[PDB]
Amino acid sequence: GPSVFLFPPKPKDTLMISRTPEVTCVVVDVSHEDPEVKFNWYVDGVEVHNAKTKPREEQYNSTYRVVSVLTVLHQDWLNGKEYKCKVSNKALPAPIEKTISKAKGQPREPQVYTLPPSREEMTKNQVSLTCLVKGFYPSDIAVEWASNGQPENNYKTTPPVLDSDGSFFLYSKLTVDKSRWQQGNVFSCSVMHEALHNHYTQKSLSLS
Amino acid sequence: GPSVFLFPPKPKDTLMISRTPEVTCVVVDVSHEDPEVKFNWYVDGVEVHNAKTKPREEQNSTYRVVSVLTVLHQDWLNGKEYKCKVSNKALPAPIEKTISKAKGQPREPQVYTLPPSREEMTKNQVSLTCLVKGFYPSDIAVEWASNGQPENNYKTTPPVLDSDGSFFLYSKLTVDKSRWQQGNVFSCSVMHEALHNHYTQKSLSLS
Amino acid sequence: KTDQQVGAKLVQEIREGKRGPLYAGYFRTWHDRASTGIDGKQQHPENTMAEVPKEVDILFVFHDHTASDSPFWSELKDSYVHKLHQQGTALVQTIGVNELNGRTGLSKDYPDTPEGNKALAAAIVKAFVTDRGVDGLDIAILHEFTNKRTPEEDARALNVFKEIAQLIGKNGSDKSKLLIMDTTLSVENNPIFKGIAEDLDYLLRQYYGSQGGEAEVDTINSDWNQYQNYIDASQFMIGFSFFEESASKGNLWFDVNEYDPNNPEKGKDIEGTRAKKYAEWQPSTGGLKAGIFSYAIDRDGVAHVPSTYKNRTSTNLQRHEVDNISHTDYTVSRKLKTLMTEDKRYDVIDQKDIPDPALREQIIQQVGQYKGDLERYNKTLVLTGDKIQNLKGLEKLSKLQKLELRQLSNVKEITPELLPESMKKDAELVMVGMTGLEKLNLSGLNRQTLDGIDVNSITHLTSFDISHNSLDLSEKSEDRKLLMTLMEQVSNHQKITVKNTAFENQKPKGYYPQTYDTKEGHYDVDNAEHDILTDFVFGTVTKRNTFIGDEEAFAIYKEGAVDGRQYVSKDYTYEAFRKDYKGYKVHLTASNLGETVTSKVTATTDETYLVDVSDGEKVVHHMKLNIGSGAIMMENLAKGAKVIGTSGDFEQAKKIFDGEKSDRFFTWGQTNWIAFDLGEINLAKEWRLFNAETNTEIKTDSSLNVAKGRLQILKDTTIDLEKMDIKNRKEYLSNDENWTDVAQMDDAKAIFNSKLSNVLSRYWRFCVDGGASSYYPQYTELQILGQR
């Protein structure tokens, strides 16, 4: 029978004014025989009709997937309102109801520290610019890098890790050619979190 | 019905001669009514009889049953498959779960210790950082030390897949700023199959 | 003679369609008793290909699991083919497309080059046709879900396939061999089909499981609508599948009956099966189909696993009695073949349909040999030669799209009861060299034109009747000039009377004019309502573009006559002819650049509008409309304005001056401001704010609208913000003392427009003072409207 999965918005989208956050609802293993899938969306038990259902997508022979995407208001999400997705189908005994809301708990402001390469790494053609973000709660966060106003894109960020004080921390690691580091270019580590002013801070990192 | 989880050995145990690595097999949600749980263990599809089943544990009216197979360091590191097979009356067919070490050219970790940020030095506790990058497979172990004694107030990130196919992580030891400024030496120990004797140490002191 | 000289006669008589409707079946090699696996062990002893009955016209050898050194292949070549040929069953070898495209097989042994692909093709014919001892090749080109084939792969496949078509098939060196494609791709996503269709004997479309709609054949009819442009219906074959053993979700089609615990033989009943549906199904157009085929004919008669097992899987496997292997009688196959051959549509065309033997011959060669083809054929029919006496039976070609009558010298009469009903719905009618024709009656066929009638070759004409058509016989019409020739032809043999030159009672159809004249309309300031559609975008035309503006012009049109004989039907109302201009909308952009949708304009003040008139799907007319003296078109002076400061995100503020409403500006609060620079001083006459709900990307509720705000200009008329330090600039623009209000907003309108007192200002600021709710207010676009 059909299953339902309800995914929350990307944390950057909830926190940034330039972006529009979305709750997404996926129905998998839909039969070819009874294909009509009706979605109903609720925000604190209040029906909303502004959702946008994408058409079916054959996964394998005679089995489809159906996604519905509800745009959310930044404030509603951040105030921890419940988003309920209700799915109906002929091959269901009763409709399926899945709910998600934002992680509750006293927010704690992230502390952002940029760390330069190790002397030992400077023997290599590419060096590692590091950004430490610690002491934040909840674990919803987004980290990006930049340089001269342009996005730097060759980076990887660790998942949040629970620290011993109940808060979270992570590391992001931008990799750059040593040449660019030594020439004295400035790099920026952008952190986005609900407990920051305007959900945003930037720390810089250049050669001393 | 009953579920099965098969956990690999702790990477330090596979890599250190002082330690004995173990594959562990856990059966959860066993009913009071049909409680008999038989385990069968296989190493490259070859049955082994040296496993050790611990008795049931009420985790209501539902038990948990753990079976622990000791492994040989070489077998694990040569990437042999460990299969755990579970039988029960409340199972339609037996459950078979397998784990092995990730196959692939091993790559030696590069260990770099990073001192606190200038900005963190305004605080009563500061973060000593250890970056380990470019290692494969992702089985690794990181510890801290100072003056021969273990430092224990640290957390390490899970391995993260880098863009070049290797792994990296960060370990973050937290110390009182006083101890950092007084010029004590700290060590970041890394244990991995691609290191000589599966071991290196990088130092970190005030500069 | 030989196994190859017998097989050539099967292929020939199959290709020429002498078998009636065809039944075919894919036999799975690994269910023949001769088949062996890689370990050289027998796989299934229960069945053999030799037992396939004569009702199976074509047996497809479908290979997997059978090892390539198996004794099966010798048995197929040396034993089965001989046995099957004796009853008149052809063998066809099925190979996959990956055999051609480089992915597997002999294609990885030959380079993807013009010469390499040719040599490969010949290697494939030898490997899979000549050496296996069969009568043809069937390429299987299926839908990929995951590792979709590269355009380079499909292009190769086609090139290899076309080379195979040179060796075997209808157009090959060796015509003793069938060439077939089976597929699961629609024409739109099947580029190989399009390229090879001309060389195929059959396309075999697999339609296992439901194909949508009440009768579960939507996809078949929709697909055929495309297939018919590339192949004849006589080449088209649809397939169902039998129940395969141990089939999981993804291969459960329910094309045959389910297991019944009280009737072991239910699997052999074809009543209420998709199999019977496909046997019965025929195309709407083109003609009767070639036949049907089954997948896994070795499973003929086995009941389907019950619906309750519909979602069983390879891991989660719930086996059933019907998953066991069994000998088959091919009971279902023989019932489905008999059904089709007993269908009355496949009855041949006889003298009861078309009496004239000469006409019957030609129609058969062109449309098909079955009664049910006549109904469906929807292309061209060219009738020629002096043997045809009469055209009786031609009326049965109801869907014929074009009829060409060429040099039919013994045809003396054409009446409307002879021609097909398609002639009343604009089918083409050509006639050239009708030297024996004396009477041309085309009355009551709604002919909108006389095109196709070569009047000069109709040299023995004595009478004609083209009355009760939809012709425009007005003075400057081509159709009148053709009528004049028809009358001159008649006048050569006898005096022109009414009894031999009927052309009256025309009801010409109305069309919308393609272009309207008025490019610049004008009204006085008369304080009256005017209608832009009635005044400027009006009128109806004929098929020959004769313009009738109004009722009065239609009256004059009706009074028209040839030789004092009124040709228009008297009982034909203007209401019928005229176009109603239904769903025509008028889009009006003022000098304000404000937009409205209305055909009405009350001429109260001086104004100029740009007018775009829409039929409903497209704009049919543009023009300007000056009310009175007019007004000079304003421009948005704020378009592409430079943001110089804001209380919020700097980059987001720039989206108020991009000219779309596809993104919004807001802040984490109920108040914000954006200061901006038009670059020069210009005369600002009005302003316009497009509020939150104007968003054309996310359907935005009006509760997110700006309720209150102020537009402002800088006080210091001539200050150089150019030369100011960034830090000072922000402090300066933030400080309310430097700004004078020039406009107020007090309404959460979707669009807010007000006038300005001829404001000359380079620098501006728009402050949001409050929202329509607690939700932080948004807006999408800001215009400052005036002259440069």
Ligand SMILES: *[C@@H]1O[C@H](CO[C@@H]2O[C@@H](C)[C@@H](O)[C@@H](O)[C@@H]2O)[C@@H](O[C@@H]2O[C@H](CO)[C@@H](O[C@@H]3O[C@H](CO[C@H]4O[C@H](CO)[C@@H](O)[C@H](O)[C@@H]4O[C@@H]4O[C@H](CO)[C@@H](O)[C@H](O)[C@H]4NC(C)=O)[C@@H](O)[C@H](O[C@H]4O[C@H](CO)[C@@H](O)[C@H](O)[C@@H]4O[C@@H]4O[C@H](CO)[C@@H](O)[C@H](O)[C@H]4NC(C)=O)[C@@H]3O)[C@H](O)[C@H]2NC(C)=O)[C@H](O)[C@H]1NC(C)=O
């Ligand atoms: C999806 O459905 C379509 C049909 O539906 C069509 O498309 C959909 C989307 C809708 O639009 C429908 O309306 C529309 O009709 C399938 O297409 C036909 O469908 C049937 C089944 O429905 C297929 O039969 C299966 O075929 C495989 C083998 O298939 C060969 O051909 C395929 C295409 O050409 C290709 O994809 C395969 O890889 C394979 O190709 C070959 O590869 C080998 C090397 O691997 C090579 O030597 C061959 O020369 C080459 N052959 C070619 C190119 O033709 C067959 O294995 C299947 O049977 C197994 O499973 C059955 C139960 O499901 C079971 O009863 C069978 O006995 C058999 O199972 C096994 O038996 C052996 C021996 O005893 C044992 O060793 C195995 O362990 C055991 N295995 C398992 C797991 O059961 C089956 O007959 C047709 O291929 C296909 N095409 C035609 C022309 O009919 C499409 O295949 C479907 N997709 C999937 C993933 O199922």
Ligand SMILES: [Ca+2]
């Ligand atoms: Ca905009």
